[PDB]
Structure 1
C-alpha cells in the first residue's frame, strides 16, 4: 500500500532483444516473428552521421553486411527495407518467444516501461513519461540505442518507443515502432535542441490523489477554484494548461477520495504558490508528474 515508480515486468520484451552490428557499430534490435527492427543509423559510420543519405547508404549494403545475434547464435538476415527511421530486417528464423504485441503511437504526458540494453543484453528496466516537449529523461549511455519503451495490457505488449539518440541537454529522442520520430527531431548529428518542457499537470494531480489514498492529506485545503483561475496560476509556474477533458479523466479518483477535482486544484494551486514547507508528499520533496491517473488507479 505504498507508492513506487513501477514498470511492467520486462520478460516478454527480453525474449525479443537482439544485437545488430554493421562494421564497427553495434546497437539493439527488436526481433518479432521473422523481423528485426532497429534504428536505421546502424548503417552510418563516422562522417555519415554528419547529414547522411539513408536511401543512398542502404542501397549499397548487402544482407551479409548485417551481423545479427541472439546470444551466441547469429541470425541470417535474408532481406531488408527501410521504414522512416527504422530498418526492418528479415531473417530465416522465427522468434518462438514473440509475445502478443502491437505497435502504438503514444501521446506526450503518457508513461511507459523502458528495457535498457547494450549489445542485445538487458541491463535494467524503468518507468518514465514522454515529456510534453517529446523528449524522455532516461538513463541512456551510448550503445543503448534500440532499447524499447512498452506498455502491457493483460497478455499483450504495446511497443511505443525505440531510442535513437541523446540531445545536448542530455535528454533522449526516439520514434514509434514505425520510424516516426517523437518531436521535431532527425537522426543526424546536426545541432538540434529540446522544445521547452512543461510539467504534466494531469499527472501531478493524480499523484496528489495517490498521496491521499495513502493517508497523506496535509496539502489539502478548504478553498476551491475555477478551471480558469487554476490555469492562470499554474501556467505562471510552467505547468501545462488544464482542460475539462483532463478533469473528467480524474473523475474516478475524485469519486474514490471524495475530494473534488477543482478542490484538488485548489490544493495544487496553494502548493505552487507557497513552497512546500520542507514537508514531503509520498516521501517526495518536490512534485511528481510521471504518474498518470491510469497508473495511480492501477497501483492503488
Structure 2
C-alpha cells in the first residue's frame, strides 16, 4: 500500500542522453541508433530569437559546427537536418545502449516521466501530466532543454516529449519527438502564454479510487448521481466533462472497490461543493488530477 507520484525507472533513457553544443549554446540531445535529436533552438543566437528563419540559420551551418558529447566520448556528426522544431544530427556511431523505442504523441490528461538533464548528464526523474492547455508543470532550470519525457511498457520506451521552454507563469512547453509542439507555442520570442486550464476529472476520480483502495473512505456517501447532473457541477468548477468512455475506463477500479463510477461522482460533487473540512486524501488537502486510471491500477493493484 501507499500511493506516490512514481516515475518509470530511468536507466534506459539515461543511456541515451548526450550534450549538443553549437556556438556558445549547449543543451541536451537524445541519441538513438545513429541519430541525435535536439531542439532546433540550439542553432540560434540570442539576437536570432525574434523572428528567426530556422531554414536560413541551418543552411549556414555544417556538420563541424555541432559538438556532440556522450559522456567522455566525442561523437562525429556526419549529417544534419531539421524536422519541424527538432534537429536530427546523424552521427558516426550507433548508440549501443539504444532501447526498443517508439515516438508517440500523448493526449492532454496523460502522464509521463521526465528525466531532467543538464549538459547531457541526468539530474532527476519525476512524473508529469500533459495539462488540458498543453503545458506541463515541470521542474526545469536553464540548460534543461532537450530533456525528454517518456513512458515504458515492457521493455519499450515510448518517448512523448522534448523540452523546449518555460512560459511566463513558470510552466513548460515542448514538442513531441517529431518536433511538433504541444499546444499553440512556438520556438521564437513572443508574448505567448499558457491558455486557460481545467482539471482532469477522470484522473481525480481515478485517484479517489486509489484512496479507497488504500483505506481513505471518509468522502464516500450512499448517494449517486447522473452523468448529466455531475457534468453540470463539473462545468461549474472548471472540471472537464466526464464522458461515458471515461466511465468505461474507470470500470476495473469501480469493480475492484465495489463503488459505482456515478457513486464516486456523487462523492466528487460533494467534495467540490463542501471542500474537505480539514481532512486529507492520500496525504493531500486538494483534489489530485495527475494520476491516470492506468497509473492507479499499476501502483494499487495488490
**Same fold, TM-score > 0.5, yes or no:** yes
Using the TM superposition, give the Cα deviation of residue 10 of structure 1 relative to its aligned residue in structure 2, in angstroms.
Answer: 0.2
Q: Secondary structure at the match of 2:30?
A: strand
Using the TM superposition, give the Cα deviation of residue 98 of structure 1 relative to its aligned residue in structure 2, in angstroms.
Answer: 0.3
Counterpart in the other structure of 1:31: 31
Q: Secondary structure at the match of 1:231?
A: helix
Structure 2 unaligned blocks of 5 or more: none
CA shift digits 1:139-187 (9 cap, x unpaired): 0111100000000001000000000001111100011110110001110
Using the TM superposition, give the Cα deviation of residue 262 of structure 1 relative to its aligned residue in structure 2, in angstroms.
Answer: 0.3
Cα distance in 1 for residues equivalent to 2:202 and 2:142: 32
Cα distance in 2 for residues equivalent to 1:246 and 1:49: 42
Using the TM superposition, give the Cα deviation of residue 260 of structure 1 relative to its aligned residue in structure 2, in angstroms.
Answer: 0.2
Cα distance in 1 for residues equivalent to 2:285 and 2:167: 28
CA shift digits 1:91-122 (9 cap, x unpaired): 00111000000100100000000000000000
Q: Secondary structure at the match of 2:280?
A: coil
Using the TM superposition, give the Cα deviation of residue 52 of structure 1 relative to its aligned residue in structure 2, in angstroms.
Answer: 0.3
Structure 1 position 193 matched with structure 2 position 193: yes
Structure 1 unaligned blocks of 5 or more: none
Using the TM superposition, give the Cα deviation of residue 195 of structure 1 relative to its aligned residue in structure 2, in angstroms.
Answer: 1.2
Q: Secondary structure at the match of 2:269?
A: helix
Q: Secondary structure at the match of 1:239?
A: coil
Using the TM superposition, give the Cα deviation of residue 235 of structure 1 relative to its aligned residue in structure 2, in angstroms.
Answer: 1.3
Cα distance in 1 for residues equivalent to 2:46 and 2:286: 42
Counterpart in the other structure of 1:3: 3
Using the TM superposition, give the Cα deviation of residue 67 of structure 1 relative to its aligned residue in structure 2, in angstroms.
Answer: 0.5
Using the TM superposition, give the Cα deviation of residue 73 of structure 1 relative to its aligned residue in structure 2, in angstroms.
Answer: 1.2
Cα distance in 1 for residues equivalent to 2:187 and 2:199: 26
Number of residues of Structure 1 aligned to a counterpart in Structure 2: 300
Q: Secondary structure at the match of 1:173?
A: strand
Cα distance in 2 for residues equivalent to 1:62 and 1:80: 8
Cα distance in 2 for residues equivalent to 1:299 and 1:208: 14
So what's the TM-score if we normalise by structure 2? 0.99
After TM superposition, where is structure 1 displaced by more than 2 Å over at least 4 residues in a row? none
CA shift digits 1:253-274 (9 cap, x unpaired): 0000000000000000000000
Cα distance in 1 for residues equivalent to 2:175 and 2:83: 11
Q: Secondary structure at the match of 1:160?
A: strand
Structure 1 position 229 matched with structure 2 position 241: no
Counterpart in the other structure of 1:278: 278
Cα distance in 2 for residues equivalent to 1:72 and 1:50: 35
Counterpart in the other structure of 1:178: 178
Cα distance in 1 for residues equivalent to 2:46 and 2:147: 22
